[PDB]
Amino acid sequence: EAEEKYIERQLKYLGPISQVSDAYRLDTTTLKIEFDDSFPEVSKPGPALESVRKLNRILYEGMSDAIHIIFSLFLGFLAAITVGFFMGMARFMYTYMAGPFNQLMFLLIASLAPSWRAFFRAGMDPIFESGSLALSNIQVRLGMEGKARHKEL
Amino acid sequence: EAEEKYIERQLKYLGPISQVSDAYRLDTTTLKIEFDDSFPEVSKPGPALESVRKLNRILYEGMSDAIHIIFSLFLGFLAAITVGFFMGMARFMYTYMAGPFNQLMFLLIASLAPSWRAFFRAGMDPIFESGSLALSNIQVRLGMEGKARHKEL
Amino acid sequence: EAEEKYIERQLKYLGPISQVSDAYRLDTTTLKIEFDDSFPEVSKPGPALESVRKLNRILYEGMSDAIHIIFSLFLGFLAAITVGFFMGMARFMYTYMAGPFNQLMFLLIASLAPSWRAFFRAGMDPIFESGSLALSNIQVRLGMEGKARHKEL
Amino acid sequence: EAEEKYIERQLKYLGPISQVSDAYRLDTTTLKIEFDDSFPEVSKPGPALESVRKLNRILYEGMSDAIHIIFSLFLGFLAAITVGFFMGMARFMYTYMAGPFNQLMFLLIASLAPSWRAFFRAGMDPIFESGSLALSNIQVRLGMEGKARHKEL
Amino acid sequence: EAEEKYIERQLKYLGPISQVSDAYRLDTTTLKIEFDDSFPEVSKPGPALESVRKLNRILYEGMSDAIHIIFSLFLGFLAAITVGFFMGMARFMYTYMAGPFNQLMFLLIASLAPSWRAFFRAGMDPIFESGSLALSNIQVRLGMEGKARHKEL
Amino acid sequence: EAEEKYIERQLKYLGPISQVSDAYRLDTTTLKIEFDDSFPEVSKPGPALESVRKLNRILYEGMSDAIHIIFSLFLGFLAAITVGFFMGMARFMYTYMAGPFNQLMFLLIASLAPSWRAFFRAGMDPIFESGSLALSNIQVRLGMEGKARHKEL
Amino acid sequence: EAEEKYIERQLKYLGPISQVSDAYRLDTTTLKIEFDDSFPEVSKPGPALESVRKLNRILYEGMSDAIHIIFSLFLGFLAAITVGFFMGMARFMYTYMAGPFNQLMFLLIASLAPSWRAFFRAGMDPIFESGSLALSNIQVRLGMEGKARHKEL
Amino acid sequence: EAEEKYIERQLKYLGPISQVSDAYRLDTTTLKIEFDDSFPEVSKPGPALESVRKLNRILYEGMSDAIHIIFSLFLGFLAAITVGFFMGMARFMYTYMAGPFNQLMFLLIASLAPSWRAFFRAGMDPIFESGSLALSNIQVRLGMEGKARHKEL
Amino acid sequence: EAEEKYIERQLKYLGPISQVSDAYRLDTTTLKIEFDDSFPEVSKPGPALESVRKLNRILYEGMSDAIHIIFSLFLGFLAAITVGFFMGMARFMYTYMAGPFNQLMFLLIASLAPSWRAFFRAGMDPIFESGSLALSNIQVRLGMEGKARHKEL
Amino acid sequence: EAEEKYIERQLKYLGPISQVSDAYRLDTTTLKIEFDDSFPEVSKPGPALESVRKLNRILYEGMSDAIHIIFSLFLGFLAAITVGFFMGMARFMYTYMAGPFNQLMFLLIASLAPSWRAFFRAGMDPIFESGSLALSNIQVRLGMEGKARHKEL
Amino acid sequence: EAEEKYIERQLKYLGPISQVSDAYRLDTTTLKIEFDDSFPEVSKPGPALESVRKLNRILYEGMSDAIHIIFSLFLGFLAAITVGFFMGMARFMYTYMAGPFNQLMFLLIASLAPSWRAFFRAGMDPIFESGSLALSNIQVRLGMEGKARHKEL
């Protein structure tokens, strides 16, 4: 069962999956809060132990949901208002103060850089043109043996 | 028997299997608690030793299951309640206090970074544009011999 | 649902995606300010919790939009004028003072560099022509085994 | 004989075989306790020496099995009970104390990490964006000679 | 919309794009001075905010263009004349003083270099002919498994 | 003769042959104790020397086999008994004392590791996400020439 | 428009373009002295600004060409004569003094080098023949998965 | 003649030939004791020198064979007996004392190693899981030109 | 025009072009002494400037050729004689003194080297046979995705 | 002529040619003692110089052959006898003293090594199993352009 | 003309050309002693200068050949005799004194090396078997895009 579904999921897409191109992400997607994950089992229960598991499951989940509901209703109500106020101010500041500052800084930088680039390169490039000659004159001799078998499915 | 099933399992999927992309995982899946694994044997028993193995197996497993059942029933019932309370509070705090803090921090960071990026790069890039010339001017001469045999199955 | 659309998006283009060739960019595209992202949830709500989520959503979004509207109307109006003045001056200076300076600097640099290049290379090149002989005389012997299976879909 | 079966076993599967992905394994599978392995021979015996080998084999194996049977019957009986007790307690503790602790630790960690990630990257990334320019501007010239022979079996 | 056009643009040409072969270039092509870029928005406006955006846009752009026009007309007029004078002198000097100096320097250098090259190489080459023997005698054994699936579109 | 059989043996299997995956092996398979190997010859004997070789062979082999037979019969008999006793005890201890200890140690370790993993990674990972940007922006230009000849056997 | 012609120019030739094989070259080909390049613009002008651009263009270009013409006629005339004299002398010296000196130096060097080469190699080569054994005994096990899609245009 | 047979011998098998997998081998196969090898010639003799070579050959070979025959007959006779005695004792000791010691050592080692492995890895692995992120995010752009010619023989 | 001929010249031969295999070469082939190269122009002349260029060209070239002719006739005549004398002596010495010395040195070296080679290798090789085991036991798992488009011209 | 035969010889076999697998070889094959090689010429003689070459050739070769013949006849005669005596003794010692010593040493070594191997590996291996995790999690994105031309001869 | 013949010569053979396998070679093949090479010209002569070149050529070549002829006739005739004497002695010594010494040294070395090899390896190999585990567990994810164009000529 499990391994078959796992292999089916692995065979759909074989390419890269990294997420390093985004620096402003949360970690919430990895967490798992559920009875089968919070209270792991080392080997398969028998029917004599399944009843105990069954009782404990409802106790745990009922308590966990009750507390969350109560706190969300009677304290989240204030948190939403309070966070909304500061988030509105933050949006205003981002639009009307940071962007213009960054654009003006870009203009001030882009007018000086070319001369420094040219000046440094004109003086330093020969040292690496000379060093380039070390990777000329590569020469390889190769010999091979091989066997192959193949099938059509 | 065993090696054949092992090879059959190996030939289904030949790709990568690492799990480094998840930093919040448990190690429970690797453990094996069973008589044939807890009391290993160096070579195949004969029928004169199988009887002793048979007696010891039931003794071990019966004791192991009895203790676990008793403790699960008379002490797990309290652990479930106690853990549920704190887990409810933890969920509330994660939703209503951490997320807003992180989003506000993201807004405060994203408004300063571009200028530092531009300023550093404008001053440091030429040093690596000059160093790039070392990998130009590669030149290779190659010669080959080969034999091959193949079959259709 | 979600994983299928993700895989569909991944399979359209498999090439490089980096943006290092631009040094004057903002980070705004990565941010996400919305209730479902500002107040994350660790596991799927049930219908008893969806109502609380529903109330909190409207409270948060209403406050956030109201503050932004008011500040944009009664303070952004002055910011636009003030930034426009300095941006006009910045454009004039970029066109009529920086460009000529950079072009004259280019002319002054390009008239001296060739002699320094020739002088340095004539004295330093032999040291890397001699070092080039180390990568001659490579010789490889190789042997291979292989099995393959394939399908047409 | 032997080399042929060895080659037949090698040609079934040519892929990786390492076991580094499991950190909780025993070494029992490598051991070999048998007369032909415990008392190795440097060269093939003749029929005059096979008789001596034959006598020594039965002596060794009989003694070895007798001692193991006696100790397994009259001492393994107590070991099974004693180990079963502690293993039951160990299972209970693993399920009802370690898992909840680890999950709560995960929740406490996952709420702080994003801000540290963003803060560090925003300050350190440009230093490696600048260094990336060294691997641009690679250029290769290549020339080849080749001979090949092939067969269908 | 946007991602589709982006992918269409990416699929036209998949080759190298670097510009390191030119050391005398400006950075003007990367800049973007426009209201939608100078005053970025974190999420899509609604129609109640579009009106405020609409007013601010015309204010900003009108002021920015007016100042630039006035300064270009009443100060760029003098800048053009003044820069033209010095640029004419610069062209004359580049043609009639730098080029001859560089050519004469080339002649003076090219008459001495060959002897230094020969003298250094004759003394230093053996040290790298001896070191070349380290990359002889490479020998590789390789085994492979593979599965493949393919389609015609 | 000899080289042909050597090449025939080499062409059967061309894959890897190392044995590093087993840490508990003996070296007996490499030894060769025989007259033609114990008393090597630098060049092919003639018939006048073959007679001397023939006499020496029987002397050497007869003495060597006699001593081994006598010692195996009158001293190996005791060695077999003595080693069998200790090997029986060793098997008992391996089964009934080492395995349980190792399994209990596994349980004690596997309950602590996840938290340390998460804690270390959450603090250290950004330092290597930043360093990952150095291998972006690789760009290659390549040109080729080639000649080929081939045959069917 | 522009990007299409750029891509058309890029697709003609995809090979190496470096110029490191020539050490006696000028940098004139990279420079661009023209009004559209000397006085860059950050964004497209409108028709109200095109008139100002039009006036400034003729002023700049007229002044620049006038000064260059006058100086070329009344001072380049003497520069040509003066440079011609020294260039004639330089050609004579290159032909009749440098070449013979270099050829005689070649003869004096080529008569001593072989002995030094042989003497050094005979003493140093074994040290790198011994070190060559480290790259024998490479062994690889590989496994693969793959999907492919293709089209004819 | 010679080069043709050399090339014929080289073309039979093109794979690896190293012998590093055996640590208990002699060097006798490389030696060559014969007149044409003991008394080398720098260039082809003429018929006037072949006669002198012919006389010297028989003198050398006759003396060399006579001494070897005499010493083999009158001293090798004792060497065979003496070596046979010690070799018989050596075989007995190898079978009946070393093998059991090594097997018992294997059992004593294999019972302790797993715990040390698990303990070290649980503490040290995260440091290399974090370091693994440096080889993500590789991105390559490549362009190619090629010409090819081929023949059937 | 120009770029088309450049590309036509680049597409004829795509292989290596280095000249490091010759240590006794001159640099004359790189130089360019002509009016269009000695007096470079930054941008295309108009017909009003072409006349000035036309006058200066003839002045420069006439003077340059006159001086060279006169010096070649009235001073090269003596240089040829003087250099011929010393070159004749140099050829005689190269043939009749250097070659014999080098051949005798070769004979003296080639008689000592083999013993030093054997002696050093016999003592040092094991250290690199042991180090060879580090590159055994390589194992790779790979997975791929791909899209392709192609045309016949 | 010459280059054609050289290329014909190069195209027969394109594989490896090194000789590092033999440590007991002489260098005689590289030497060339002949008038055309002992007295080299820098450029082709004319018929007026061929006569002088012709006289000198016979003088040199006649003297060289005469001295060698006389010394070979009247001194090589004794050298052959003297070397034959010691070579006979050397062969006897190699067969009847070195081989047995080496075989006995092999037996003494092969009985101790396995325990040291196991003991070291059991303690040191985890340190390199942990370090193996650094080469997991490699991820590559690649894009390509290509042109090709081909011919049948 | 010239470039076409150069390219024709380059396209005949594309393989390795190094000569490092021979340590006893002269450098005469690289030299070029001729008027067109001894007295190089920077640019093509006109017919007014060709006459001066024509006179100088005959003067130089006549003097150079006369001196060489005279010295070859009246001094080479002694050199040939004198060198022949010593070369005869050198050949005799090479055949009858160096070869036997080297062969005896080979026999003395080849009898000691195996024991040192075995002894060192048995103690040092485990250290590199343990280090081999670092290159296991490599895992790669790859994705590709490609375009191709091709022609038949």
Author numbering:
A (entry chain Q), B (entry chain R), C (entry chain P), D (entry chain H), E (entry chain O), F (entry chain L), ...: 79 to 231
Task: Give passages from the manuscript.
Caveolins are a unique family of membrane remodeling proteins present broadly across animals (Metazoa), and in vertebrates form flask-shaped invaginations known as caveolae. Unlike vesicle coat proteins such as clathrin, COPI, and COPII that cycle on and off membranes and share evolutionary origins and structural features, caveolins are unrelated in sequence to other vesicle coat proteins and remain integrated in membranes throughout their life cycle. Each complex forms a disk with 11 spiraling α-helices and a central β-barrel, with each protomer forming contacts with two protomers to the left and two to the right.
We next determined a 2.9 Å resolution cryo-EM structure of the S. rosetta caveolin complex. The variable N-terminal region forms a short α-helix that is positioned about halfway up the β-barrel before snaking along the cytoplasmic-facing surface of the complex. Each protomer makes a 180° turn at the hook structure, which is followed by the spoke region. The α-1 helix forms the rim at the edge of the disk that is ∼16 Å in height. Finally, S. rosetta caveolin has a C-terminal β-strand that forms a parallel β-barrel with a diameter of ∼30 Å and contributes to the ∼46 Å overall height of the complex. The detergent micelle surrounds the hydrophobic face of the disk and reaches into the β-barrel. As a result, in the S. rosetta complex, additional contacts are made with the i + 5 and i − 5 protomers as the variable N-terminal region of i rises up the central β-barrel and contacts the C-terminal β strands of i + 5 and i − 5. The three β-barrels have a similar outer diameter of ∼28–30 Å; however, the S. rosetta caveolin complex’s central β-barrel is ∼10 Å longer than the other caveolin complexes.
